[PDB]
């Protein structure tokens, strides 16, 4: 289908619609494609799963259901007319679609139209109600009665097919069809009057049945075996978890870039048991307040640096103006987009992408000059006092940018030279 990365890149109108839906993706699009000059094909090539998510969101429809059984008219009846319900009725009933397609633009307007459609005999007839001859309905829609009957016979013709043999009761009734016994009672014949004409409950059963086979064929759209279904697994072997076990072998290697004796440890054990059974002194442990003073010096030396870190233990409040702040934010964001595309370039490992790496490296050099002239402008317009903040803030991304340049240069000298 239209599910390949090529087709997702091809659906430019869908790209247009989702771009118009988003806002920061718009701003990124003008800065890259319109301002910097990024080709669209590799703009969206980093956003293929998001394109797919939007395509799935747009390209889905709902289950069919009986609009008629659900919807009740509730004296002009009030209607909560939904265009989704209208199209539900339309592709539920092509007779209603054909009655629509020649009446709104040619004969009468839309509100008088759907007023006649609620008024009509075919409304309550195709609705879960036997049609009454007392009802006047809509005489214009009464011309569609024999057209819908033609549709009924045509749909019955296309639905009719040879029946699976074991299920088929026609084989049972035609097993001995030459039986001349006695017919059953009035009980077993269908509900008819004294004139023999039926009530039509078999007809409405046919209609709801035909609704179920329209559901079956809606499933059965573009979008031997008897032995297995007659086989019984009740007295058979259960399914075995064929899952593989895992065993471990463990040998940790030691790190890559004096010994006391048994006599020594025995005599020290002897000494420390002698001291333990000898004496414990309570107040001998108090330090001499100079070695304790150096202890305090070391502790407060730790405390000063660690609490200075703990002084700095939505984002933080900034002294930048909002225009310069957003400009450095968006330039940082698009330079991150460049560098992610550069990792796409370098980690591709293809000679095919060499001119892409070259032209993008020119774009990155332009980004470098943009950053330098940006820092120069903030320097000369602010006296460096917050341009220091701007440069320190944008420092790590340009550091990784320089890392990318040094990798490209070093690898260029490795393979070329």
């Amino acid at each position: 289908d239209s599910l390949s990365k090529e087709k997702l890149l091809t659906n430019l109108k869908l790209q247009q619609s989702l771009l118009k839906g988003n806002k920061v993706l718009m701003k990124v699009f003008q800065e890259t494609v319109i301002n910097a000059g990024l080709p669209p094909s590799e703009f969206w090539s980093t956003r293929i799963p998001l394109l797919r998510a939007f395509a799935l969101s747009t390209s889905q429809k709902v289950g069919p259901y009986n609009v008629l059984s659900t919807i009740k008219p509730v004296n002009k009846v009030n209607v909560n007319l939904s265009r989704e319900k209208i199209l539900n009725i339309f592709e539920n009933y092509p007779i209603v679609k054909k009655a629509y397609t020649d009446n709104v633009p040619k004969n009468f307007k839309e509100p008088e139209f759907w007023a006649r459609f609620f008024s009509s005999k075919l409304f309550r007839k195709l609705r879960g109600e036997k049609i009454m001859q007392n009802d006047r309905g809509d005489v214009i829609i009464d011309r569609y009665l024999t057209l819908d009957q033609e549709f009924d016979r045509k749909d019955d013709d296309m639905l009719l097919h040879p029946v699976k043999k074991i299920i088929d009761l026609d084989g049972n009734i035609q097993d001995d069809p030459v039986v001349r016994g006695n017919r059953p009672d009035f009980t077993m014949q269908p509900g008819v009057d004294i004139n023999g004409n039926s009530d039509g409950t078999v007809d409405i059963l046919k209609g709801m049945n035909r609704l179920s086979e329209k559901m079956i064929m809606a499933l059965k759209n573009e979008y031997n075996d008897e032995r297995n279904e007659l086989k019984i697994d009740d007295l058979n072997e259960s399914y075995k978890t064929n899952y593989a076990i895992i065993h471990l072998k463990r040998n940790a290697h030691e790190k890559t870039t004096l010994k006391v004796s048994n006599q020594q440890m025995l005599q020290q054990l002897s000494l420390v048991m002698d001291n333990l059974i000898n004496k414990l002194d309570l107040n001998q442990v108090v330090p001499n307040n100079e070695v304790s003073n150096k202890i305090n010096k070391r502790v407060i030396t730790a405390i000063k640096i660690n609490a200075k870190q703990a002084k700095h233990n939505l984002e933080v409040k900034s002294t930048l103006p909002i225009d310069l702040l957003e400009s450095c934010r968006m330039l940082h964001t698009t330079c991150c987009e460049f560098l992610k595309h550069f990792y796409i370039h370098f980690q591709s490992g293809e000679q095919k992408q060499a001119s892409t790496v070259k032209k993008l490296y020119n774009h990155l050099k332009d980004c470098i000059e943009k950053l330098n002239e940006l820092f120069q402008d903030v320097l000369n317009g602010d006296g460096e006092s917050m341009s220091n903040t701007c440069t320190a803030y944008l420092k790590p991304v340009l550091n990784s940018i320089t890392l990318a340049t040094h990798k490209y240069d070093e690898y260029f000298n490795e393979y070329n030279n």
Partner: peptide
């Protein structure tokens, strides 16, 4: 507002211009 529409419809004809060329 309206100002996004002339941007994206100029880009519609720009994509067609590179499509024919």
């Amino acid at each position: 507002e309206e100002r996004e529409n002339e941007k994206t419809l100029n880009d519609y004809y720009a994509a067609l211009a590179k499509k024919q060329a």
